[PDB]
Design a binder for this molecule. Structure first.
Ligand SMILES: *CC(=O)CC[C@@H](C)[C@H]1CC[C@H]2[C@@H]3CC[C@@H]4C[C@H](O)CC[C@]4(C)[C@H]3CC[C@]12C
Ligand SMILES: *CC(=O)CC[C@@H](C)[C@H]1CC[C@H]2[C@@H]3CC[C@@H]4C[C@H](O)CC[C@]4(C)[C@H]3CC[C@]12C
Ligand SMILES: *CC(=O)CC[C@@H](C)[C@H]1CC[C@H]2[C@@H]3CC[C@@H]4C[C@H](O)CC[C@]4(C)[C@H]3CC[C@]12C
Ligand SMILES: *CC(=O)CC[C@@H](C)[C@H]1CC[C@H]2[C@@H]3CC[C@@H]4C[C@H](O)CC[C@]4(C)[C@H]3CC[C@]12C
Lengths: 310, 315, 310, 315
């Protein structure tokens, strides 16, 4: 999967993700109101007046298990597969704010209003894992974004300058790998000469030659970091939703491109987004590219029950 | 730009093109009914009962200039930019069928029912470049296909080239011979999960799916777009339903779409996939979405009185 | 194999080739004097006073079969494998200068003093093939170089602006393939930014990223065209011999890199060169990188017998 | 720069490095006999009967600053540039063995006989960066190996890292953890002849050898040089004679050599493989050639009175 974040001219948030897998987990748009009472698994704190949050989630037991969610104040968080590198403790620790892995997205969206508050609180947080989900998290608002990678050596809180996250390996690898492609440009290739041979481009795109096209995790990071960094800034909601869905489409997994270990094909089953300017969640699926919208002002946020719209 | 053709299990035609450019020409879904009277520019011969055609294009001097179109029998054609290689005569040749460049997509759709019928007639055809008064010279090559196979028509300075398109895909420059020799570089890429191996004492494994596909280029240049979409079209598992096949078409073309900001033209503007059009012969329907809207709109041959006498242009 | 040509500041010739194969053909430095009488196979013409030539060759029958040779006036020619694309006629044609394939290198070096005379004469030449060797030829002097590709559609005489030749496919492919790499530079990578991320190079070489490193024929052409076009010009014999052998070493085939269809490994068995400034032939082998020299002024050129020095 | 290590069937050591730079430092083959008295800078402990060592370096204050060296027991070490990642303390740490950076190659060669002996002692070692008065701070990592295995010693801001080098090769930046994760991208490249396959209806074949190796990078950047030389060292068939093994060393290092004009430094000059040095433990001989001369010169331990008391520097 792929995580993308950017902003417009007014500091608004635009946040989105792809979900690449073989089978659907019954994903549905889940709205968690503020009047909904949540009992944290390991006795973690939170805001007195919680924030209304929205996203894509299943409803296991009686708890919202968000794949990706955002709150009414512009903060968003998504989780991505990190197996072979993620490593959690299975027992709580006294003296720290203990949050379970599955509740971590719902936790940060309910209580925090900016990425700065998240990076501040994470210094006293233990991620407890009760097959288990081995994930890292992509968190961002209208200003910047951070990556949370919990490994066997501790918790790493990377500042994400390319506003882009992908699966394995570690974030330090992807950032070092980007330096291999620093000369790739979006300018039209300048006519040059190799001895007496004059070389010209057939058209646009030759200056971008070098970017990989495979759907592997390190190569998807490079391709979507390039697209996000070079996409011109927009100043209205319609264009920025198009920008987010087009930027994510550049690393989509088309049926037939690569199998798993189970033998099935990795496919971008759905693509979710979020805009803080309108407080709306967007989503389309592999079988329907139409972009459906789910606004926050269309649900009773002071209600007390999770609503799972189909 | 990219043209794509494949088929389901019943032999129907699934055909689609990406239009990459920096500005629009006012294109629209164009209906050319059977009762419309077309007076060819250079006297080219036509069918007795002409085929009803559907596609995307503009109208000029009451003549449909199709960017791409298809008829009621599952035959489709699209024109893709080919400058610096395409070369046409500007005079008709007596003794052969003389079809102008702009009328070529219309001409093959009205009077032919299969690629075999098409490929035979090109043996006695001369594309004549007639400069449209207010426009520029269109130096294009064409991508024709049906529910069985596809061909490429490249008319260069050394005559006409008609290639059997085995990979069922076409892009821009250079010649089709280059693209197929270029594919031999990426013959080793595989959609199989990467097999764990070892380099001396180091044991290498894959983080996940896609490592075996490493090597496929990811830039939006014409040759790289060719390699990538040829891999995507060849490895997509065959579908059996119409909704699944329409999904395969717009997703295969999405693998080589041009996102705003990716690459500038020679004039300072960005090349974007302005629209994506498609056709299905199982239902005789044209599909189209734009850069501003991924909703796949549908236009069926049955929703238009195809025995009318005038061009129907729907927005 | 690879063919390389360049010149110094005084129009002198520097010409060289690698020979990539599994087994040695008994290659030896062969000197063909001018007093040596040669009987052309199909009755082809030639100069009255022949040119003394030198190169690497075997002595089948009583004819010098040169892999690569040069004459005393600065012209050089080498042959490279072109199977699956080379196609010759097997019967002579009346009215044309008929030269057999194996005699073609010895033919052009004996009679011609410049590349211009070669391109002029080739308009009335038929290459006759009497397993057969399917080759194309790399011919050059101190000014330019040409490629001679005899295919089933006729003879093509390409002007070689990159002064570089490699095996399959056709020359028109390699020249079109070079346009994919026109943005690769030898400048130190300029620090750039992808959003808020500042990208710098670890050191020199990042600007050259994009050039392939495999030893396949199309990729070797690209790598050696880059090296030859960017190698700074030299103004003395010692440096230009180093330039030619280093430029050719950039595409050498090291044991273990790639097998053949027979199962054996392709290895650069030897590397031959030639300088017209000194009229000397240079050569080293895979088992000895020492550069041995064989001057023209050390052999009796007015003699009448081929001397094959070991 | 690149360091390479492999072995024959008898377990001897074959070790070599490429020195890529734009200017020379006056290096030369340096003899440090057993009778030479070295007063370590920070009181590091040494062997009772020290090993006679051979290598390439300079002399400063009557102390051999080895670029790379090896002893009479088949243990070799080389220092490669590692700026922006290497970080050293500038004060000795009481309770541990304190070895200066410039004396590190000398120190491990005089007092150790195997990589196992080495790797154990690093547990109680502190490399201290002492700025040479007239020179700059050397931020290096080291490549140590014998006739069995090799290790990498990277001393960064977060402590010492000692990696088991399974691919038996080392380049410059970045950290060794990056290079080994980077190798997983090229796990699919193969030295086998490419297997004919088909993409839909198109049948792809290889023009010849090397197509299965497609994907290996060819630029002279530090990561790409790592991938390429790791493939060359891992796939070279094992040799049994000394002449064949010396040929393998200088040819494996030739696969990543830097030719004049390929890449400019940050100061405007070209990086060239100034020299290439090597060592063989089957004969206890050092080998070296330069950019101006590919003739492999030999310098054997037996050709020098190794019981002398002074440094022997041969041009
Ligand atoms: C994007 C990527 O590569 C990983 C996608 C799949 C495997 C992930 C994405 C979100 C995951 C959910 C999150 C909610 C719960 C959390 C529980 O701890 C485990 C079950 C759960 C449904 C996760 C399963 C994997 C998941 C779908
Ligand atoms: C997708 C791609 O490669 C870019 C090609 C564009 C610019 C081409 C493709 C179809 C062209 C039309 C065809 C109809 C008429 C023909 C006239 O001769 C010129 C005007 C015309 C509208 C063409 C303009 C360029 C065009 C859209
Ligand atoms: C460089 C490359 O890829 C091809 C190398 C080998 C296969 C070529 C190079 C020169 C060839 C000689 C040339 C002399 C005669 C010519 C006869 O027509 C056939 C035999 C001959 C020895 C050639 C064999 C192939 C050859 C070594
Ligand atoms: C090959 C490569 O990566 C480039 C590294 C070069 C510039 C390094 C490698 C060895 C270095 C020597 C080591 C001995 C002394 C140490 C002193 O602290 C500084 C001077 C010295 C000669 C180093 C200079 C840089 C050097 C050649």
């Amino acid at each position: 999967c792929t995580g993308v974040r950017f902003s417009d001219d007014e500091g608004n948030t635009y946040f989105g993700r792809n979900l690449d897998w073989s089978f659907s987990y019954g994903e549905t748009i889940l709205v968690t109101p503020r009047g909904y009472h949540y009992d944290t698994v390991f006795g973690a704190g939170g805001k007195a007046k919680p924030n209304a949050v929205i996203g894509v989630g299943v409803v296991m037991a009686d708890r919202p298990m968000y794949f990706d969610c955002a709150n009414e104040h512009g903060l968003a968080i998504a989780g991505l597969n990190f197996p072979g590198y993620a490593s959690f403790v299975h027992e709580p620790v006294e003296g720290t704010e203990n949050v379970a892995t599955f509740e971590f997205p719902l936790w940060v969206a309910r209580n925090f209003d900016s990425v700065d508050e998240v990076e501040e609180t994470l210094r006293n947080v233990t991620l407890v894992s009760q097959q288990e989900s081995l994930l890292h998290w992509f968190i961002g608002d209208g200003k910047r974004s951070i990556v949370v990678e919990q490994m066997a050596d501790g918790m790493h809180v990377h500042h994400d300058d390319v506003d882009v996250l992908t699966n394995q390996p570690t974030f330090d690898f992807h950032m070092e790998n980007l330096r291999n492609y620093m000369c790739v440009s979006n300018e039209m290739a300048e006519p040059t000469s190799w001895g007496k041979a004059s070389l010209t481009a057939w058209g646009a795109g030759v200056g971008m030659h070098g970017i990989p096209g495979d759907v592997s995790s390190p190569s998807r990071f490079v391709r979507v970091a390039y697209t996000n960094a070079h996409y011109p800034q927009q100043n209205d909601e319609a264009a920025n939703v198009s920008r987010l869905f087009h930027t994510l489409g550049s690393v989509q997994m088309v049926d037939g491109m690569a199998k798993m270990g189970d033998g099935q094909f990795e496919r971008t089953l759905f693509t979710s987004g979020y805009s803080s300017k309108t407080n709306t969640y967007y989503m389309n699926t592999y079988d329907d590219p139409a972009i459906r919208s789910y606004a926050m002002a269309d649900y009773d946020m002071d209600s007390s029950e999770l609503i799972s719209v189909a």
